[PDB]
């Protein structure tokens, strides 16, 4: 009972800027303990507009990169609430129709390696991640037309171990869709851009390993082998580190990733 009242109060407190900051903090942490939080956020008057205001207010501090720890903490609570709106089945289609991801694209364009920026990009990726996990064709077709693949690949190449995992995960969920695989493999340009980054990643992974990032890079390579045009291209460009005993030690524990790489090499044979 009392628990819900506290939540309803905070949702209503998001509407006035005088209480918005604290209401963001309290709700962003109670986020996982409240299952129906997303439709409560969605069907409360001017709650989404308040969340989007928190995003647009931070735009002048993005470029030039003058975003502070406090500024980042505040916007990342708002982005966390959008993350859960993106996840929920009742609100996901409505969130996409409201083009909410387009507000995060400036954040994903940032390169500043400061923690306020690290957190901003990671939380923003988490929103796209939440949207893709739902394995919805409509999400995929949105993402394909909005040029997220370039933004992901930039992060995938030169981001934090985890933000790289999250961006690779977003690429993976696109590639898993038939239309997504068809799109990336449609032109040599598109495929070559993806494969080059994926390969570059295998090389950094062979130096500084990440058993979770390798799991997603392997799944990406394996999914590309489903397209014959990509399979033939991969017969030439596949990193030698995936063919030999490089990752054999780190994959002693991961029997699933071990299976994927075993299937990939078999798929490439013929």
């Amino acid at each position: 009972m009392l628990e819900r009242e506290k939540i309803y109060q905070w949702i209503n407190e998001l509407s006035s800027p005088e209480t918005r900051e604290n209401a963001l903090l309290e709700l962003s942490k109670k986020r996982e303990s409240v299952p129906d939080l997303a439709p409560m956020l969605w069907h409360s008057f001017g709650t989404i507009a308040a969340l989007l205001q928190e995003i647009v207010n931070i735009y002048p501090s993005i470029n030039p990169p003058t975003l502070t720890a406090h500024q980042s903490n505040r916007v990342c609570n708002a982005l966390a609430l959008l993350q859960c709106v993106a996840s929920h089945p009742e609100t996901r289609s409505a969130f996409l129709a409201a083009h909410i991801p387009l507000f995060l694209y400036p954040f994903l364009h940032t390169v500043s390696k400061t923690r306020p920026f690290e957190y901003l990009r990671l939380t923003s990726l988490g929103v796209i991640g939440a949207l893709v996990k739902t394995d919805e064709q409509e999400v995929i077709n949105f993402l394909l037309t909005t040029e997220i693949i370039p933004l992901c690949l930039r992060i995938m190449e030169s981001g934090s171990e985890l933000s790289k995992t999250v961006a690779t995960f977003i690429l993976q969920k696109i590639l898993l869709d038939d239309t997504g695989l068809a799109y990336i493999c449609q032109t040599y340009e598109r495929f070559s851009h993806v494969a080059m980054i994926l390969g570059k990643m295998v090389l950094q992974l062979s130096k500084e390993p990440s058993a979770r990032l390798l799991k997603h890079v392997v799944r990406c390579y394996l999914r590309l082998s489903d397209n014959p045009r990509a399979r033939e291209a991969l017969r030439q460009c596949l990193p030698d580190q995936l063919k030999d005993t490089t990752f054999a030690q780190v994959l002693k524990d991961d029997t699933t990733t071990k299976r994927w790489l075993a299937q990939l090499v078999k798929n490439l044979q013929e």
């Binding site: 903490n73 923690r115 990671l122 999250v166 979770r212």
Partner: peptide, 22 residues
């Protein structure tokens, strides 16, 4: 505040770590 940033980052890290898991 900067001490809280590192915490909130670590929390997001752990959160997204479970999201990518399949």
């Amino acid at each position: 505040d900067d001490q809280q940033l590192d915490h909130n980052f670590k929390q997001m890290e752990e959160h997204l770590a479970l999201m990518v898991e399949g």
